[PDB]
Symmetry: C3
Subunit: 146 residues, 3 copies
């Protein structure tokens, strides 16, 4: 019996692993325990944020070079800059994750963030992986993390 349950769990592990690859192709990227997935279209920050939260996740929040590289692959594939989850909407000059925590990693392009026009509280990631603070009202690729 204990062995009969083995044959099942074993089959499940194999089937699940195959299904995982299928699911991630071509809009997902796995990095560590995190999975990034793009919706394939653009939206303003507030709408992008809501879409990810309702899906049980949150906007892409790269916390390391490895995660940022994984996210970058999606941006390049779609050739569309994407929104990150971080903003300095609460306190200008201080970017935070949705929880309020301060950034543990950043990859700002030279000179950024610069709050251009005194109205850039959101963050976009370019095809080169670099970050730029941009107006939250702009529309960018929606990428959520799970």
């Amino acid at each position: 019996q204990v062995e009969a349950l083995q044959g099942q769990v074993q089959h499940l592990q194999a089937a699940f692993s195959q299904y995982k690859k299928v699911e991630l192709f071509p809009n997902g990227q796995s990095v560590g325990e995190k999975i990034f997935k793009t919706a394939g279209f653009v939206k303003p920050f507030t709408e992008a944020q809501l879409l990810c939260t309702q899906a049980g996740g949150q906007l892409a929040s790269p916390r390391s070079a490895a995660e940022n590289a994984a996210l970058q692959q999606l941006v390049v594939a779609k050739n569309e800059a994407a929104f990150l989850s971080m903003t300095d909407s609460k306190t200008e000059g201080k970017f935070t994750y949705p929880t309020g925590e301060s950034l543990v990693y950043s990859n700002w392009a030279p000179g950024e963030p610069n709050d251009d026009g005194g109205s850039e509280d959101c963050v976009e990631i370019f095809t080169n992986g670099k970050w730029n603070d941009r107006a939250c009202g702009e529309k960018r690729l929606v990428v959520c993390e799970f």
Copy 2:
């Protein structure tokens, strides 16, 4: 062995939970034990019906307000009215599920169904969640349930 086998099932459960969220974003919606998934494009009723059946499911068949609201979320997201599986092709005035049973739930807009032009045997759901009988030849968003 149980000790280790429990660790495997626990890993599968956790991994699967994550992947379910990933899979449903952004074209799926879970409600109870039913899952709605949109193909993202429009098709006439017959073509839409065949796509769903060949995929191992059937056209969206909301049987409760909760299921209807879940379906509505997809229709709103794609901003395209979708076909439901029910029709009154067999007997005019009596809408049934693909199996033949009569409806157990309905959310008709006022005055519907009205068999306009004496030729509306299919059903579409609007972005406001209401139903309208419509010509089966029209093209509407394809949403299947599994």
Copy 3:
């Protein structure tokens, strides 16, 4: 604690089966233990091949009439001819899989392969399921197998 796990596995099995069908709709097709999935866009051969390999799979490689029929379903649904993995880049006239192994199945359209222009080393599958050797530089629907 035995019946405990057995219960969880059965239910995990059922949930996985449902998510499998949801996953394949509308861009995937399962045949045997193989799964075909289209990216939904076209790319030149090398780029397409790279996308599949990086995803942990490879370009569509139908090895039987059954596999070819399943692949043809996706080509028909997308209405776009797709690249297969096989090429005769090494030895003109001799088509092989990425491993170097010779074909074990083929469905060449009448008059094919003809190496037209003296430079057609890749293979495409039409909506009718037939194959045609085509210049690897052309762009065709990307379909991987897992």
